[PDB]
């Protein structure tokens, strides 16, 4: 679902919350958390370098397994599916028969109690991992490595996936969640299925304070500043842009492409995103 | 240059285009009613199709063409006339097949076809 609220405060009127339906364990595997050092957007010089962040609820990092080829053939039971404060998607607790425990992004479909496994010879059911080369074309897939043995990098957000579109020699071809067509290496793992919690997009924060709980401090318009402050700053009264609309640092911000012209990964991108 | 090959006869209402191809299917030369000289609706006539199929064979024959299979597409005017024209050109006409593309109820047509 997604959960509405009777409009008993003016904020409650619109605010929606996640349904938490698929979640079954409310404490994280003690042995799998480590504390996340909050940054507040500031780097090692101490300087803010990403604006308006800070003051979010405290979190523990849940150690996630983005490799999986780590343990080929060793199968595993899906113990629980839990909330993770650090991602949109949910995480699944795996008890390997080995006795090792690990956390994975819960794919949409995964039913607690089921079993899963990774390796070239894995069955093509939800939750399993294999090299892309051994994944049937047309199947939708998540958590994809971008280069071998380098860790899942693609489609990890609640409800994302990719689609295998055909192979060509060493590489295979994905429609990345964004629509881009890219060649990924065949030896890159991916997990079958698409990421769960796919309703995540339909959440209505509802009030300033929720944006605050999430570590997001208020954002101020270039329009609302002074000229020392921002390209758009000043004018007596309101003002339009009076110039092509820009970031605080002066660069145009409508339409201006920004990817490096000569990037080597260009050779492997087939069709830039759409829409 | 090749001895044998193909002939494609596009027969619309507004025109007839004819391309002569190689064995595998890649073009050697083509023509249409416009090329032989007509503009506007005269391109749609059987005479136009005639000249165009003729000029088509002629142009092909100069690259050595002798045998051709003929693919006819489209319920046009200069359809059949274009066929005559081909035979009478001094080209073999090894066979004649209609391969007009037609939907098994595909896309919605323009208003004009409903």
């Amino acid at each position: 679902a997604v959960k509405k609220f009777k409009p008993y405060t003016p904020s409650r009127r619109f605010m929606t919350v996640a349904d938490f339906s698929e979640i079954t364990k409310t404490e994280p595997e003690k042995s799998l958390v480590k504390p996340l050092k909050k940054t507040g957007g500031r780097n090692n010089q101490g300087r803010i370098t990403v604006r308006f962040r800070g003051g979010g609820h405290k979190r523990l990092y849940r150690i996630i397994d983005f490799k999986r080829w780590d343990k080929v053939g060793i199968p595993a039971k899906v113990a629980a599916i839990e909330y993770d404060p650090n991602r949109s998607a949910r995480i699944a607790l795996l008890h390997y028969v080995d006795g090792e425990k690990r956390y994975i992004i819960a794919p949409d479909g995964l039913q607690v109690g089921q079993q899963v496994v990774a390796g070239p010879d894995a069955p093509i059911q939800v939750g399993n991992a294999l090299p892309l080369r051994f994944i049937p074309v047309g199947t939708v897939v998540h958590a994809v490595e971008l280069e071998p043995k380098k860790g899942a990098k693609l489609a990890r957000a609640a409800g994302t996936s990719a689609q295998i579109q055909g192979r060509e020699g060493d590489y295979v071809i994905l429609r990345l969640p964004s629509g881009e067509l890219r060649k990924v290496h065949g030896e890159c793992y991916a997990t079958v299925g698409a990421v769960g919690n796919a309703d995540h997009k339909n959440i209505v924060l509802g009030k300033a304070g929720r944006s605050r709980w999430l570590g997001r401090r208020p954002h101020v318009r270039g329009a609302a500043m002074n000229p020392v402050d921002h390209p758009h700053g000043g004018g007596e009264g309101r003002a339009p842009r009076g110039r092509p609309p820009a970031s605080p640092w002066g660069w145009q911000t409508k339409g201006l492409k920004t990817r490096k012209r000569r990037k080597p990964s260009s050779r492997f991108i087939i069709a830039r995103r759409k829409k | 240059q090749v001895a044998s090959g193909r002939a494609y006869i596009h027969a619309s209402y507004n025109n007839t285009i004819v391309t002569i191809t190689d064995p595998d299917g890649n073009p050697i030369t083509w023509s249409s009613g416009g090329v032989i000289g007509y503009k506007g609706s005269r391109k749609g006539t059987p005479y136009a199709a005639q000249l165009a199929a003729l000029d088509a064979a002629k142009k092909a024959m100069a690259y050595g063409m002798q045998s051709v299979d003929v693919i006819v597409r489209g319920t046009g005017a200069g359809r059949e006339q274009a066929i005559r024209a081909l035979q009478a050109s001094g080209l073999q006409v090894k066979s004649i097949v209609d391969d007009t593309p037609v939907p098994h109820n595909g896309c919605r047509p323009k208003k004009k076809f409903r």
């Binding site: - | 066979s95 004649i96 097949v97 209609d98 391969d99 098994h104």
Partner: protein, 68 residues
């Protein structure tokens, strides 16, 4: 020139009987009418329902070029 005649016993629901069936298609592959097959109403339906099934399996065409 009635097709129903030209063949002895034939099962209508045999979607594999590629030999019988193929006699019911025009030279362009279009499934033939009763005015050419000689089927009654009911027969006709069963035949058509199975020809199509064949075409799906790969044994009968969906379409074929007209030759002259």
């Amino acid at each position: 020139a009635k097709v129903k005649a030209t063949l002895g016993e034939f099962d209508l629901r045999d979607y594999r009987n590629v030999e019988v069936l193929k006699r019911f298609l025009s030279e362009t592959g279009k499934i033939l009418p009763r005015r050419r097959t000689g089927l009654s109403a009911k027969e006709q339906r069963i035949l058509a329902k199975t020809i199509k099934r064949a075409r799906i399996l790969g044994l009968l065409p969906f379409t074929e070029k007209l030759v002259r």
